[PDB]
Design a protein around this motif. Structure first.
Motif, PDB file in Angstrom:
ATOM      1  N   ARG A 105       0.836  -1.201   0.000  1.00 21.06           N
ATOM      2  CA  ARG A 105       0.000   0.000   0.000  1.00 21.06           C
ATOM      3  C   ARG A 105       0.877   1.260   0.000  1.00 21.06           C
ATOM      4  NH1 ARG A 105      -3.253  -4.223  -0.642  1.00 21.06           N
ATOM      5  NH2 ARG A 105      -5.319  -4.020   0.358  1.00 21.06           N
ATOM      6  N   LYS A 116       2.644   4.429  -1.333  1.00 18.70           N
ATOM      7  CA  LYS A 116       2.449   5.380  -2.435  1.00 18.70           C
ATOM      8  C   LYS A 116       3.812   5.863  -2.979  1.00 18.70           C
ATOM      9  CE  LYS A 116      -0.768   8.523  -1.712  1.00 18.70           C
ATOM     10  NZ  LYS A 116      -1.160   9.736  -0.912  1.00 18.70           N
ATOM     11  N   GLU A 117       3.895   6.116  -4.284  1.00 17.94           N
ATOM     12  CA  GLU A 117       5.177   6.427  -4.930  1.00 17.94           C
ATOM     13  C   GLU A 117       5.776   7.792  -4.532  1.00 17.94           C
ATOM     14  OE1 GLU A 117       4.606   6.915  -9.260  1.00 17.94           O
ATOM     15  OE2 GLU A 117       2.455   7.137  -8.851  1.00 17.94           O
ATOM     16  N   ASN A 118       4.957   8.680  -3.979  1.00 17.28           N
ATOM     17  CA  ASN A 118       5.483   9.975  -3.550  1.00 17.28           C
ATOM     18  C   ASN A 118       6.457   9.817  -2.384  1.00 17.28           C
ATOM     19  OD1 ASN A 118       3.179   9.324  -1.916  1.00 17.28           O
ATOM     20  ND2 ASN A 118       3.310  11.379  -1.049  1.00 17.28           N
ATOM     21  N   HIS A 161       1.022   7.693   7.495  1.00 12.80           N
ATOM     22  CA  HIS A 161      -0.032   7.061   6.711  1.00 12.80           C
ATOM     23  C   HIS A 161      -0.783   8.028   5.806  1.00 12.80           C
ATOM     24  CE1 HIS A 161       0.004   3.754  10.002  1.00 12.80           C
ATOM     25  NE2 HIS A 161       0.939   3.562   9.080  1.00 12.80           N
ATOM     26  N   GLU A 162      -1.129   9.200   6.326  1.00  9.20           N
ATOM     27  CA  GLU A 162      -1.870  10.158   5.519  1.00  9.20           C
ATOM     28  C   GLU A 162      -1.103  10.608   4.268  1.00  9.20           C
ATOM     29  OE1 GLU A 162      -3.122  13.049   8.411  1.00  9.20           O
ATOM     30  OE2 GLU A 162      -4.767  11.744   9.073  1.00  9.20           O
ATOM     31  N   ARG A 205       0.639   6.179   2.637  1.00  9.54           N
ATOM     32  CA  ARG A 205       0.018   4.861   2.608  1.00  9.54           C
ATOM     33  C   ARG A 205      -1.386   4.975   2.049  1.00  9.54           C
ATOM     34  NH1 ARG A 205      -1.862   1.561   8.006  1.00  9.54           N
ATOM     35  NH2 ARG A 205      -3.479   3.162   7.775  1.00  9.54           N
ATOM     36  N   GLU A 206      -1.664   4.184   1.017  1.00  9.06           N
ATOM     37  CA  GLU A 206      -2.995   4.074   0.428  1.00  9.06           C
ATOM     38  C   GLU A 206      -3.939   3.349   1.400  1.00  9.06           C
ATOM     39  OE1 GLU A 206      -3.407   5.433  -3.147  1.00  9.06           O
ATOM     40  OE2 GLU A 206      -5.062   5.808  -1.747  1.00  9.06           O
ATOM     41  N   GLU A 207      -5.139   3.880   1.620  1.00  5.60           N
ATOM     42  CA  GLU A 207      -6.058   3.272   2.592  1.00  5.60           C
ATOM     43  C   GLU A 207      -6.588   1.926   2.095  1.00  5.60           C
ATOM     44  OE1 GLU A 207      -9.067   6.464   2.616  1.00  5.60           O
ATOM     45  OE2 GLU A 207     -10.446   4.927   1.777  1.00  5.60           O
ATOM     46  N   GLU A 208      -6.459   1.711   0.791  1.00  3.45           N
ATOM     47  CA  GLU A 208      -6.895   0.482   0.167  1.00  3.45           C
ATOM     48  C   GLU A 208      -5.884   0.128  -0.912  1.00  3.45           C
ATOM     49  OE1 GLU A 208     -11.320   1.413  -0.429  1.00  3.45           O
ATOM     50  OE2 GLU A 208     -11.312  -0.711   0.147  1.00  3.45           O
TER      51      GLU A 208
END
Ligand code: HEC
Ligand code: HEC
Lengths: 135, 135
Positions: A75, A77-79, A128-129, A132-135
């Motif tokens: 999960r 994210k690429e950023n 997480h915000e 990390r993707e929530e899904e």
């Protein structure tokens, strides 16, 4: 052992989830009151969390892990890889707050523990915000 | 908010795999020599292992977790619930070796680190040989 990407994802997912179990134990005992307060159990839980915070999980992140299945599809994210400074700030703050939760838990004051437990929760969430993707 | 069996399995699988990552880092630095020795990295890895050893994982073991999927179908063998004295012997030996590994990793004596790492390794296998279905 240059780890395969699948192994990197699996180890970091395992590390986070391990911290989650131990966070959950402190939550039951000092926030929700659904488990009796135990200094030794809260301290042991805090120690796992501090230890994993210091375990250098940065070695588990490389761009070829994007979208890769560990226990489940990553999960991440690429950023994460572009906002390098922001990662380091968030991560170094997490280490600081995790260290303080272990110190406070050792001294066994429920109110102090609840306060610092709150600061750690905020540190988990900050990462997480952003990353990390929530899904 | 008592844990469901699936969560118990997932949390214990996560816990073992986290120790496995950290054991691997120590192996690389003090046994295989594929990573440069780092005093701070070896002790941070050892600390995770001792913390999880002391994290009270018995709370994750109940018969209704047998055969239950966490990240994957649990490999716990049921003779576990028949062996209370032997589980306590193996677990408390594991805590002892894990505690000692963390103590020597702090003090930095590389051959003593290699030696005690071996003792922890034997403790991992002792439990697996009785209670974990091999793959
Ligand atoms: C960034 C610096 C993070 C900090 C600090 C924390 N978490 Fe995290 N967490 C992060 C990422 C990028 C991911 C996704 C990992 C992947 O490859 O999929 C996660 C994941 C979790 C999970 C789920 C793990 C899983 O089993 O798949 C949990 C349960 C979790 N994170 C909890 C958690 C807690 C409790 C933290 C603080 C104590 C925490 N995380 C910090 C990024 C970051
Ligand atoms: C008994 C007291 C154990 C000790 C001590 C150690 N391990 Fe273990 N391990 C044990 C069981 C019963 C299981 C199966 C759990 C399940 O429900 O499936 C395991 C599993 C592992 C795994 C795989 C976890 C996963 O991702 O599915 C690993 C990687 C593992 N064990 C490693 C490990 C290490 C490195 C240990 C010493 C430091 C160790 N284990 C000790 C039982 C017990």
């Amino acid at each position: 052992d240059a780890l395969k990407p699948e192994d990197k994802v699996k180890f970091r997912q395992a590390s986070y989830t391990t911290m989650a179990w131990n966070m959950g134990k402190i939550k039951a005992m000092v926030v929700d009151g659904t488990m009796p307060f135990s200094q030794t159990q809260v301290s042991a839980a805090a120690n796992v969390i501090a230890a994993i915070a210091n375990s250098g999980m940065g070695a588990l992140y490389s761009p070829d892990t994007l979208g890769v299945v560990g226990f489940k599809k990553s999960r991440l994210k690429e950023n994460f890889f572009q906002e390098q400074d922001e990662v380091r700030k968030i991560a170094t703050n997490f280490v600081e707050q995790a260290n303080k939760l272990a110190e406070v838990a050792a001294m066994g004051d429920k109110d102090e523990i609840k306060a610092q437990f709150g600061e750690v929760g905020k540190a988990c969430k900050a990462c997480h915000e952003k990353f990390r993707e929530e899904e």
